[model samples]
Target: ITSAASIGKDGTIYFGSDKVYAINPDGTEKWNFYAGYWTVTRPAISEDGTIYVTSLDGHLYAINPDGTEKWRFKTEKRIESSPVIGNTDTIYFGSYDGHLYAINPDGTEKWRFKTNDAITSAASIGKDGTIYFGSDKVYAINPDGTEKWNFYWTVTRPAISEDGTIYVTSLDGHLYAINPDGTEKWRFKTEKRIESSPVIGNTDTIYFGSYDGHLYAINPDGTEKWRFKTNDAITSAASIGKDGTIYFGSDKVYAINPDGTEKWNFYAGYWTVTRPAISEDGTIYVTSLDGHLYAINPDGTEKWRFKTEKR
Candidate 1:
């Protein structure tokens, strides 16, 4: 089974199973790599075939297209989250040891920024090369591994926008904006913890979900633009399309407008479904705990469903 899937610039489908596998759009396997570890994190493919991923057992590896190991590095704790790509092949990710790592493609550690608590969240790189992610405290780590700044609240994910405004959802149930210099601009509070990341959209807005079963939209100034309520807590990131519609999952799947209006919702009938992904043309994809992945449209109609097959 795959934990996550991504479409490359050339449209190749890549996913993580026991190994990282590449498949053609026709669903035929192309190539795969095995490193004796569970590929727990999402795979990052280079312009070349330098595939990067992390394992839950405290290791990160880089592989070539021939399925050969280029290099591997170890950390002090479990590394189950995805790695963030920094300038010119440097990668950043968090470990359970409460530290973030900056490593080169050659597998050498450039530096690490320690946090106050365990970090399950993955780091995100901004458009201009700054790195952000959540821990018990929100962090802004320079590409060289030095500290830029940090916030007191815990963060789940720190997704940024084109203008360098960093939006992060905190365990304290607040979404905040950190400026380019690592200073706090503002914050938006929620009624419960927000575990998912915030994605920027509509040019100047940020969107995320709360454990309070609500999805929120905030202006760049930290003021509320709008919000939409769901029947269950939204603990995952919303896959937003180009049209300003938000698609996400909790007990089911939901689509909302940029103005905080609900467009449509589908019940997966499972207690939980993972995050939703949107296609360029408005196809939404998500999965349920009952073990099925559904492809839906922007208008709330199902296109197809795939059940997991035993490996």
Candidate 2:
């Protein structure tokens, strides 16, 4: 029932349910902070250790490392998008009210731009300070929160390559490669809905999951390199290890090699598992719908598990 885990610089695991928790590397609780009835958004930690978490109650809170609230900014409607930190210390996130907001590091409002529909995915920062995200359409927003441009629709988050090419998936079953100026470069079609965010590999290959139960590896030019099939839909994004292994969740957690071969698989609690978060020392953290957080070893074996109540 928890969101994806966020790794702090100090190796602390930060995630939320009705409340947010900072868990130590050894799988023990460090501190617990009450947020709202549905604080399921993944937390983004600042350089100074401030955690920014969104609440379905329509507020984004800045919490201290000690679990005390520093400040909160209110929006018009509930927020489902997780916060992303810009290069200049601006915090960007979207809300169901159809507005993308920019808040300064000190928790002051910077600016906000309206979208055509609600945003359910998190925003990503481009190389040039442009913010890329999806709602009714994918958008490129300036650092000042002004719209640069936009293209076709989606509610999935976008991933930008080093060259600024944005890779995004859509509910319409297509993965788009978009230019920096908001023009389409190419799109690869899938057979079903795609809510998973695309992940770029070290070799310029793109990886993503679809409701069709396939994990696709696409080339930079939009060609399909390979695809691994699963038993169920994959709604979560994939995490690439330092060694280029792909880790994601569906009916189970899977580890796929960079060349698209299966490395191993582990049965997690249940459906809608969060994306895997890999630690520097190679520990993988995964959350599941069955109300448990799993710490997996580098070889796809379970290291430990923490059970919780339904969110």
Candidate 3:
């Protein structure tokens, strides 16, 4: 698969191709669903196993485990990013139709946020209820779909922090720290565009990537902690593992220590197209442009693989 993906809490693996699919932990197909159109957007799995995903033909779908349709929603355009479920059972997602929609679990409406531009990246929801997102501009929204505050120029991907302070980067080349109350706390200017989400370390530090071939660690207060130079333009989000290690991909998969030091990176000789998911046993799964899902171990050896999609 060329698209990014995520797994469910029950280890029920969810992924996308021409359509969407749910598989068991051992890789047996549980359900194969059709969107009636194409969708590059990843699916979300709730506690109750409801699947939320979008179709390239312009609708959001909610389906059950039995491959039966639950609800379908029409967007003015298709969605580009994955949906994140809030603690309150509300769904936050972005759309190319130029809005962030808050949806209820039972197939009802909550509210909509218009960004005046298409939103291709996913929104990051903080524990404090401050929602972060990106379009041409980085946006922050309250839980109710109202604007808490926004930064016209900042990072353009996912923003999250461990201690609850929100972080966002912009296409305009800067990272920002916004308080829970929507006040600007600090900002760090970078040398390249940011199109990937950030990850939080166990020490509450922030790590993110940019087109400049650099992965940066910015202190929670917006100071520079460290930086690691990469070999390509990285557009994938970072995922922190249980042992405080950071995992992400660009043309390949890389791992970094909590202090921003290089640990290991495995090259698949192709472009990595998504974030790497860490299994409970430390095996990592990431997709590539080569149409293969490469599974690797923590020490940087190939584990297992599966292929999907022709592109």
Ranked by TM-score from best down, the candidates are 2, 3, 1
TM-score for all models, in order of appearance: 0.85, 0.94, 0.89
Q: Rank the candidates by lDDT, best first.
A: 2, 3, 1
lDDT (0-100) at residue 103 of candidate 2?
A: 92
Q: Candidate 2, which segments miss by more than 4 Å at Cα?
A: 309-311
lDDT of 3: 0.74
Give the best candidate by lDDT: 2
Model 1, residue 18: C-alpha shift (Å): 3.7
| Model 2 score (lDDT) | 0.85
TM-score, cand. 2: 0.94
Candidate 3: give the clashing pairs: 154-169, 154-170, 155-169, 155-170, 156-169
Candidate topping TM-score = 2
For residues 61-160, write the lDDT of model 2, one tens digit per residue.
Answer: 8999988999988866667678899887789888777888889988888988887778778899998899988887788898977789988767688898
TM-score head-to-head 2 vs 3, winner: 2
Candidate 1 lDDT by residue in tens digits, 37-145 = 5667667877665778776556787877666788888866777457877867888777777877788878998887777777787888876677777766667776766
Candidate 3 regions with alpha-carbon error over 4 angstroms: 136-138, 152-155, 309-311
State the C-alpha lDDT per candidate: 0.72, 0.85, 0.74
